[PDB]
Amino acid sequence: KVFGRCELAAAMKRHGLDNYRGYSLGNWVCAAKFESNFNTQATNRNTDGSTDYGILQINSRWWCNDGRTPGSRNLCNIPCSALLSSDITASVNCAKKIVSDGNGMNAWVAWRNRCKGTDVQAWIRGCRL
Ligand code: NA
């Protein structure tokens, strides 16, 4: 599924991501934009052999099981495939664990480099939320 900007804002708010660990909805939509271009089926291989899955490019290194990431953990207790669903529940549940891990949204390197400190409210501008 390719979400619209306001559609994804709405889904994230419904799943309780808005101001989660103090991160406004704009921050989450911005992170999703640059991680996946709002595509739930986005997958990208990392140089270390791990893979990033879904709207928030969650890494098999730590968070999900893909059966092909040696020495990895599955701290969200899910198959990485569940992070590719048109339903964003698994992605949101696991993103709450990641953002709680101690470095907040810096865990998303595209958030740090492309969203952090920017006018993130622009991402929910004109959405009926
Ligand atoms: Na894993």
Side-chain angles (χ1 to χ4, degrees):
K1 180 163 176 193
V2 184
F3 277 84
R5 182 171 60 78
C6 293
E7 185 190 16
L8 184 57
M12 286 175 159
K13 174 164 185 179
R14 184 171 87 74
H15 291 101
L17 204 52
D18 67 314
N19 216 40
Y20 189 93
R21 264 302 224 271
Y23 287 97
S24 71
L25 194 45
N27 280 285
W28 297 104
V29 177
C30 188
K33 173 66 171 175
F34 291 133
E35 287 298 353
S36 73
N37 208 10
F38 301 146
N39 190 349
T40 61
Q41 307 195 249
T43 64
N44 289 287
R45 196 65 143 291
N46 300 139
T47 61
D48 72 347
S50 66
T51 303
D52 293 353
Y53 294 87
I55 42 136
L56 289 178
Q57 289 297 94
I58 296 182
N59 192 347
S60 64
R61 174 59 185 91
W62 291 107
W63 305 109
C64 62
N65 176 60
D66 67 5
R68 67 162 201 201
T69 309
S72 69
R73 309 290 299 281
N74 177 15
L75 297 171
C76 296
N77 303 111
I78 47 159
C80 296
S81 56
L83 301 183
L84 300 186
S85 173
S86 56
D87 191 302
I88 71 165
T89 305
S91 283
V92 168
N93 288 344
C94 186
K96 293 175 173 169
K97 289 193 191 297
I98 300 169
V99 73
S100 296
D101 192 51
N103 298 315
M105 283 194 75
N106 294 294
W108 290 277
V109 170
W111 177 86
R112 184 165 57 76
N113 293 326
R114 305 181 73 176
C115 301
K116 187 175 186 182
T118 78
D119 181 13
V120 288
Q121 106 73 31
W123 289 103
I124 64 168
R125 193 195 177 275
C127 311
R128 182 177 198 84
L129 289 164

